[PDB]
Amino acid sequence: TTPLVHVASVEKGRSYEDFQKVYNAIALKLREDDEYDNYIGYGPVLVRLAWHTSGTWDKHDNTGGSYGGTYRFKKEFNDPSNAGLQNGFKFLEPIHKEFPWISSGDLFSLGGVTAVQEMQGPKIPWRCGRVDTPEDTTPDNGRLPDADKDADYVRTFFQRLNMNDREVVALMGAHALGKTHLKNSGYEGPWGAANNVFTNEFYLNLLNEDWKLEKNDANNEQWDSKSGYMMLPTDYSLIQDPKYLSIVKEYANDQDKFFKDFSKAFEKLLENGITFPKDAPSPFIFKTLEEQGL
Numbered sequence: 419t420t421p422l423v424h425v426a427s428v429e430k431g432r433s434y435e436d437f438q439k440v441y442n443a444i445a446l447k448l449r450e451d452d453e454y455d456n457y458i459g460y461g462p463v464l465v466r467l468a469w470h471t472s473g474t475w476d477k478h479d480n481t482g483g484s485y486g487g488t489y490r491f492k493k494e495f496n497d498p499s500n501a502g503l504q505n506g507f508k509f510l511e512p513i514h515k516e517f518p519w520i521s522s523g524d525l526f527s528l529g530g531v532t533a534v535q536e537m538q539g540p541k542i543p544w545r546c547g548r549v550d551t552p553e554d555t556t557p558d559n560g561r562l563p564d565a566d567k568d569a570d571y572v573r574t575f576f577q578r579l580n581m582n583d584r585e586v587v588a589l590m591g592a593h594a595l596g597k598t599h600l601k602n603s604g605y606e607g608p609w610g611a612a613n614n615v616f617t618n619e620f621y622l623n624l625l626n627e628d629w630k631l632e633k634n635d636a637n638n639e640q641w642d643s644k645s646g647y648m649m650l651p652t653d654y655s656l657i658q659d660p661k662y663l664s665i666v667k668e669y670a671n672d673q674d675k676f677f678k679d680f681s682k683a684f685e686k687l688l689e690n691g692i693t694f695p696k697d698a699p700s701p702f703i704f705k706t707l708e709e710q711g712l
Protein backbone atom coordinates (compact mmCIF):
# COMPACT_ATOMS: atom_id res chain seq x y z
CA THR A 419 0.00 0.00 0.00
CA THR A 420 3.12 2.16 0.30
CA PRO A 421 3.31 5.01 -2.25
CA LEU A 422 4.87 3.42 -5.32
CA VAL A 423 7.40 5.18 -7.53
CA HIS A 424 6.89 5.37 -11.30
CA VAL A 425 10.21 5.75 -13.07
CA ALA A 426 10.08 6.93 -16.67
CA SER A 427 11.56 4.34 -19.02
CA VAL A 428 12.24 5.41 -22.61
CA GLU A 429 10.61 3.11 -25.18
CA LYS A 430 13.51 0.88 -26.28
CA GLY A 431 15.86 2.70 -28.65
CA ARG A 432 13.44 5.54 -29.39
CA SER A 433 14.43 9.19 -29.70
CA TYR A 434 13.03 12.59 -30.68
CA GLU A 435 12.56 11.65 -34.34
CA ASP A 436 10.39 8.65 -33.44
CA PHE A 437 8.03 10.73 -31.34
CA GLN A 438 7.91 13.54 -33.91
CA LYS A 439 6.60 10.89 -36.31
CA VAL A 440 3.82 9.95 -33.88
CA TYR A 441 3.06 13.65 -33.37
CA ASN A 442 2.87 14.07 -37.14
CA ALA A 443 0.54 11.09 -37.58
CA ILE A 444 -1.76 12.54 -34.93
CA ALA A 445 -1.61 16.03 -36.48
CA LEU A 446 -2.28 14.69 -39.98
CA LYS A 447 -5.32 12.75 -38.75
CA LEU A 448 -6.57 15.86 -36.93
CA ARG A 449 -6.44 17.57 -40.32
CA GLU A 450 -8.11 14.66 -42.16
CA ASP A 451 -11.02 13.96 -39.79
CA ASP A 452 -12.11 17.61 -39.78
CA GLU A 453 -15.87 16.94 -39.81
CA TYR A 454 -16.06 15.53 -36.26
CA ASP A 455 -18.42 17.30 -33.84
CA ASN A 456 -19.90 19.68 -36.42
CA TYR A 457 -16.46 20.51 -37.81
CA ILE A 458 -14.87 21.36 -34.48
CA GLY A 459 -12.44 18.53 -35.09
CA TYR A 460 -10.86 16.10 -32.63
CA GLY A 461 -8.49 18.66 -31.12
CA PRO A 462 -10.60 19.58 -28.06
CA VAL A 463 -11.60 16.04 -27.15
CA LEU A 464 -7.96 14.91 -27.35
CA VAL A 465 -7.03 17.66 -24.89
CA ARG A 466 -9.83 16.59 -22.56
CA LEU A 467 -8.64 12.98 -22.89
CA ALA A 468 -5.05 13.94 -21.97
CA TRP A 469 -6.35 15.82 -18.94
CA HIS A 470 -8.76 13.12 -17.75
CA THR A 471 -6.13 10.40 -18.00
CA SER A 472 -3.79 12.58 -15.91
CA GLY A 473 -6.30 14.14 -13.50
CA THR A 474 -6.92 10.97 -11.52
CA TRP A 475 -3.59 11.51 -9.78
CA ASP A 476 -3.43 11.80 -6.00
CA LYS A 477 -0.23 13.42 -4.69
CA HIS A 478 -0.75 11.69 -1.33
CA ASP A 479 -0.03 8.14 -2.55
CA ASN A 480 0.86 8.62 -6.22
CA THR A 481 -2.08 6.53 -7.40
CA GLY A 482 -3.70 7.38 -10.73
CA GLY A 483 -1.91 9.74 -13.08
CA SER A 484 -0.81 9.60 -16.72
CA TYR A 485 1.96 7.05 -16.19
CA GLY A 486 -0.05 3.83 -16.38
CA GLY A 487 -2.36 4.61 -19.30
CA THR A 488 -5.12 2.85 -17.39
CA TYR A 489 -7.92 4.53 -19.35
CA ARG A 490 -7.62 1.51 -21.65
CA PHE A 491 -9.28 -0.56 -18.91
CA LYS A 492 -13.06 -0.84 -18.57
CA LYS A 493 -13.39 0.63 -15.07
CA GLU A 494 -11.81 3.95 -16.08
CA PHE A 495 -13.08 3.80 -19.65
CA ASN A 496 -16.62 3.70 -18.25
CA ASP A 497 -16.13 6.42 -15.63
CA PRO A 498 -19.19 8.69 -15.97
CA SER A 499 -16.70 11.58 -15.84
CA ASN A 500 -15.14 10.24 -19.04
CA ALA A 501 -18.35 9.98 -21.07
CA GLY A 502 -17.61 11.00 -24.64
CA LEU A 503 -13.86 10.40 -24.49
CA GLN A 504 -14.38 7.13 -26.36
CA ASN A 505 -14.29 9.32 -29.48
CA GLY A 506 -10.76 10.41 -28.63
CA PHE A 507 -9.67 6.86 -27.90
CA LYS A 508 -11.09 5.68 -31.23
CA PHE A 509 -9.20 8.49 -32.95
CA LEU A 510 -5.93 7.31 -31.41
CA GLU A 511 -6.53 3.64 -32.28
CA PRO A 512 -5.10 3.80 -35.82
CA ILE A 513 -2.21 5.85 -34.44
CA HIS A 514 -1.35 3.21 -31.85
CA LYS A 515 -1.68 0.50 -34.51
CA GLU A 516 0.93 2.21 -36.68
CA PHE A 517 3.23 2.88 -33.72
CA PRO A 518 2.58 -0.10 -31.39
CA TRP A 519 5.83 0.66 -29.56
CA ILE A 520 4.54 3.77 -27.80
CA SER A 521 3.01 3.27 -24.35
CA SER A 522 -0.65 4.13 -23.76
CA GLY A 523 0.23 6.87 -21.29
CA ASP A 524 2.69 8.46 -23.71
CA LEU A 525 0.10 8.31 -26.49
CA PHE A 526 -2.77 9.78 -24.45
CA SER A 527 -0.59 12.65 -23.21
CA LEU A 528 1.08 13.25 -26.58
CA GLY A 529 -2.37 13.47 -28.15
CA GLY A 530 -3.12 16.41 -25.88
CA VAL A 531 0.16 18.15 -26.67
CA THR A 532 -0.28 17.62 -30.41
CA ALA A 533 -3.83 19.00 -30.29
CA VAL A 534 -2.87 22.17 -28.41
CA GLN A 535 0.06 22.89 -30.74
CA GLU A 536 -1.81 22.16 -33.97
CA MET A 537 -4.64 24.41 -32.79
CA GLN A 538 -2.08 27.23 -32.67
CA GLY A 539 -1.57 27.08 -28.92
CA PRO A 540 1.78 27.33 -27.11
CA LYS A 541 4.51 24.73 -27.51
CA ILE A 542 4.22 22.15 -24.73
CA PRO A 543 7.49 20.41 -23.81
CA TRP A 544 6.77 16.69 -23.56
CA ARG A 545 8.73 13.81 -22.03
CA CYS A 546 8.44 10.14 -22.97
CA GLY A 547 8.76 7.16 -20.67
CA ARG A 548 5.33 6.39 -19.25
CA VAL A 549 4.92 2.63 -18.86
CA ASP A 550 1.69 0.63 -19.05
CA THR A 551 0.64 -0.83 -15.70
CA PRO A 552 -1.79 -3.72 -14.85
CA GLU A 553 -5.57 -3.43 -14.75
CA ASP A 554 -5.54 -3.60 -10.95
CA THR A 555 -3.65 -0.28 -10.90
CA THR A 556 -6.64 1.47 -12.49
CA PRO A 557 -7.97 4.20 -10.18
CA ASP A 558 -11.62 4.03 -9.05
CA ASN A 559 -14.12 6.44 -10.59
CA GLY A 560 -14.79 9.70 -8.77
CA ARG A 561 -11.33 11.26 -8.76
CA LEU A 562 -12.14 13.76 -11.51
CA PRO A 563 -13.76 17.07 -10.44
CA ASP A 564 -17.38 18.22 -10.65
CA ALA A 565 -18.56 21.27 -12.60
CA ASP A 566 -21.51 22.31 -10.41
CA LYS A 567 -19.41 23.66 -7.53
CA ASP A 568 -17.91 26.97 -6.36
CA ALA A 569 -14.42 28.49 -6.13
CA ASP A 570 -13.66 26.95 -2.73
CA TYR A 571 -14.33 23.49 -4.16
CA VAL A 572 -12.10 24.16 -7.15
CA ARG A 573 -9.23 25.48 -5.05
CA THR A 574 -9.40 22.56 -2.61
CA PHE A 575 -9.83 19.93 -5.32
CA PHE A 576 -6.79 20.99 -7.32
CA GLN A 577 -4.52 20.90 -4.28
CA ARG A 578 -4.68 17.11 -4.68
CA LEU A 579 -3.03 17.56 -8.09
CA ASN A 580 -0.52 19.97 -6.52
CA MET A 581 -1.84 22.95 -8.49
CA ASN A 582 -2.01 26.49 -7.10
CA ASP A 583 -4.34 29.39 -7.99
CA ARG A 584 -2.40 30.53 -11.08
CA GLU A 585 -2.00 26.96 -12.34
CA VAL A 586 -5.72 26.28 -11.96
CA VAL A 587 -6.79 29.48 -13.70
CA ALA A 588 -4.27 28.87 -16.49
CA LEU A 589 -5.44 25.28 -17.04
CA MET A 590 -9.10 26.28 -17.17
CA GLY A 591 -8.27 28.55 -20.10
CA ALA A 592 -8.35 25.41 -22.23
CA HIS A 593 -12.13 25.71 -22.02
CA ALA A 594 -11.82 28.10 -24.93
CA LEU A 595 -11.75 24.79 -26.83
CA GLY A 596 -14.62 22.55 -27.90
CA LYS A 597 -17.96 22.55 -26.12
CA THR A 598 -20.11 20.86 -23.49
CA HIS A 599 -22.46 18.16 -24.82
CA LEU A 600 -25.67 17.54 -22.89
CA LYS A 601 -25.40 13.79 -23.50
CA ASN A 602 -21.89 13.58 -22.01
CA SER A 603 -21.93 15.93 -19.03
CA GLY A 604 -25.38 17.39 -18.53
CA TYR A 605 -24.27 20.77 -19.89
CA GLU A 606 -24.72 22.24 -23.36
CA GLY A 607 -22.95 24.88 -25.41
CA PRO A 608 -19.51 26.27 -26.33
CA TRP A 609 -17.46 28.70 -24.20
CA GLY A 610 -16.62 30.86 -27.20
CA ALA A 611 -16.38 31.32 -30.95
CA ALA A 612 -12.88 29.92 -31.64
CA ASN A 613 -13.82 26.32 -30.80
CA ASN A 614 -10.72 24.80 -32.39
CA VAL A 615 -8.15 27.60 -32.10
CA PHE A 616 -6.22 27.98 -28.84
CA THR A 617 -6.47 31.58 -27.59
CA ASN A 618 -7.21 33.42 -24.34
CA GLU A 619 -10.85 33.88 -25.38
CA PHE A 620 -12.10 32.02 -22.29
CA TYR A 621 -10.98 34.89 -20.04
CA LEU A 622 -12.21 37.63 -22.35
CA ASN A 623 -15.65 36.02 -22.52
CA LEU A 624 -15.88 35.60 -18.74
CA LEU A 625 -15.18 39.31 -18.30
CA ASN A 626 -16.97 40.82 -21.30
CA GLU A 627 -20.10 38.74 -21.91
CA ASP A 628 -23.41 39.42 -20.15
CA TRP A 629 -24.04 36.17 -18.28
CA LYS A 630 -27.39 34.88 -17.03
CA LEU A 631 -27.79 31.90 -14.71
CA GLU A 632 -30.21 29.53 -16.44
CA LYS A 633 -31.23 25.88 -16.39
CA ASN A 634 -30.43 23.68 -19.37
CA ASP A 635 -32.46 20.77 -20.73
CA ALA A 636 -30.84 18.43 -18.20
CA ASN A 637 -32.17 20.57 -15.35
CA ASN A 638 -28.67 21.79 -14.43
CA GLU A 639 -27.68 25.41 -13.94
CA GLN A 640 -25.14 27.03 -16.25
CA TRP A 641 -24.32 30.60 -17.23
CA ASP A 642 -25.46 31.70 -20.70
CA SER A 643 -24.83 34.80 -22.87
CA LYS A 644 -26.86 36.15 -25.79
CA SER A 645 -23.82 35.42 -27.97
CA GLY A 646 -24.55 31.72 -27.61
CA TYR A 647 -21.76 30.98 -25.15
CA MET A 648 -21.92 29.26 -21.78
CA MET A 649 -19.85 28.88 -18.63
CA LEU A 650 -19.98 26.08 -16.07
CA PRO A 651 -20.61 27.06 -12.45
CA THR A 652 -16.92 26.31 -11.81
CA ASP A 653 -15.85 28.48 -14.76
CA TYR A 654 -17.92 31.38 -13.46
CA SER A 655 -16.51 30.92 -9.95
CA LEU A 656 -13.24 32.20 -11.41
CA ILE A 657 -14.67 35.72 -11.53
CA GLN A 658 -16.62 35.39 -8.28
CA ASP A 659 -13.52 34.59 -6.20
CA PRO A 660 -11.35 37.73 -5.87
CA LYS A 661 -8.05 35.87 -6.12
CA TYR A 662 -9.07 33.94 -9.24
CA LEU A 663 -10.54 37.12 -10.71
CA SER A 664 -7.21 38.95 -10.57
CA ILE A 665 -5.60 36.14 -12.55
CA VAL A 666 -8.44 35.94 -15.06
CA LYS A 667 -7.93 39.64 -15.75
CA GLU A 668 -4.19 39.13 -16.18
CA TYR A 669 -4.64 36.44 -18.82
CA ALA A 670 -7.41 38.38 -20.56
CA ASN A 671 -4.86 41.15 -20.98
CA ASP A 672 -1.74 39.17 -21.86
CA GLN A 673 -1.94 36.42 -24.48
CA ASP A 674 1.77 35.62 -24.24
CA LYS A 675 1.66 35.31 -20.46
CA PHE A 676 -1.30 32.95 -20.70
CA PHE A 677 0.47 30.80 -23.29
CA LYS A 678 3.61 30.55 -21.15
CA ASP A 679 1.75 29.72 -17.92
CA PHE A 680 -0.60 27.25 -19.61
CA SER A 681 2.37 25.48 -21.18
CA LYS A 682 4.07 24.98 -17.82
CA ALA A 683 0.89 23.92 -16.01
CA PHE A 684 -0.18 21.52 -18.76
CA GLU A 685 3.20 19.82 -18.91
CA LYS A 686 3.18 19.58 -15.11
CA LEU A 687 -0.29 18.06 -15.19
CA LEU A 688 0.79 15.45 -17.73
CA GLU A 689 3.93 14.62 -15.74
CA ASN A 690 2.48 14.45 -12.21
CA GLY A 691 3.50 11.22 -10.50
CA ILE A 692 6.42 10.46 -12.80
CA THR A 693 10.04 10.23 -11.68
CA PHE A 694 12.48 11.17 -14.45
CA PRO A 695 16.00 9.75 -14.03
CA LYS A 696 18.86 12.25 -13.93
CA ASP A 697 20.06 10.99 -17.32
CA ALA A 698 16.64 10.83 -18.97
CA PRO A 699 16.32 12.72 -22.28
CA SER A 700 15.52 16.43 -22.01
CA PRO A 701 11.89 17.35 -22.75
CA PHE A 702 11.00 17.23 -26.46
CA ILE A 703 9.55 20.27 -28.24
CA PHE A 704 7.81 19.04 -31.38
CA LYS A 705 7.53 21.09 -34.55
CA THR A 706 4.01 21.64 -35.86
CA LEU A 707 3.06 20.34 -39.32
CA GLU A 708 3.08 23.97 -40.46
CA GLU A 709 6.63 24.48 -39.20
CA GLN A 710 7.72 21.37 -41.12
CA GLY A 711 6.00 22.43 -44.32
CA LEU A 712 3.78 19.36 -44.09
Ligand code: FMI
Nearest residue numbers: 462463465466469563564589592595596597598599602603
Ligand atom coordinates in the same frame (compact mmCIF):
# COMPACT_ATOMS: atom_id res chain seq x y z
C1 FMI B 1 -6.44 20.49 -19.98
C2 FMI B 1 -7.50 21.48 -19.80
C3 FMI B 1 -8.71 21.32 -19.08
C4 FMI B 1 -8.92 21.37 -17.73
C5 FMI B 1 -7.89 21.60 -16.61
C6 FMI B 1 -10.33 21.15 -17.51
C7 FMI B 1 -10.94 21.12 -16.27
C8 FMI B 1 -12.26 20.89 -16.00
N1 FMI B 1 -13.25 20.65 -16.94
FE1 FMI B 1 -12.98 20.61 -18.96
N2 FMI B 1 -12.65 20.51 -20.97
C9 FMI B 1 -11.47 20.69 -21.66
C10 FMI B 1 -10.24 20.95 -21.07
C11 FMI B 1 -10.01 21.07 -19.69
N3 FMI B 1 -10.98 20.96 -18.72
C12 FMI B 1 -11.71 20.58 -23.09
C13 FMI B 1 -10.63 20.74 -24.18
C14 FMI B 1 -13.03 20.32 -23.25
C15 FMI B 1 -13.80 20.11 -24.61
C16 FMI B 1 -14.04 18.64 -24.95
C17 FMI B 1 -14.81 18.44 -26.25
O1 FMI B 1 -15.19 19.44 -26.92
O2 FMI B 1 -15.06 17.27 -26.61
C18 FMI B 1 -13.61 20.26 -21.92
C19 FMI B 1 -14.94 20.00 -21.65
C20 FMI B 1 -15.55 19.95 -20.41
C21 FMI B 1 -16.94 19.64 -20.18
C22 FMI B 1 -17.94 19.30 -21.26
C23 FMI B 1 -17.87 17.79 -21.53
C24 FMI B 1 -18.81 17.29 -22.59
O3 FMI B 1 -20.03 17.43 -22.40
O4 FMI B 1 -18.33 16.74 -23.60
C25 FMI B 1 -17.15 19.70 -18.84
C26 FMI B 1 -18.47 19.45 -18.09
C27 FMI B 1 -15.89 20.02 -18.24
C28 FMI B 1 -15.68 20.16 -16.88
C29 FMI B 1 -14.45 20.44 -16.26
C30 FMI B 1 -14.18 20.57 -14.74
C31 FMI B 1 -14.78 21.97 -14.36
C32 FMI B 1 -14.97 19.39 -14.07
C33 FMI B 1 -14.18 18.08 -14.44
C34 FMI B 1 -12.78 20.85 -14.66
O5 FMI B 1 -12.35 20.99 -13.38
N4 FMI B 1 -14.93 20.17 -19.21
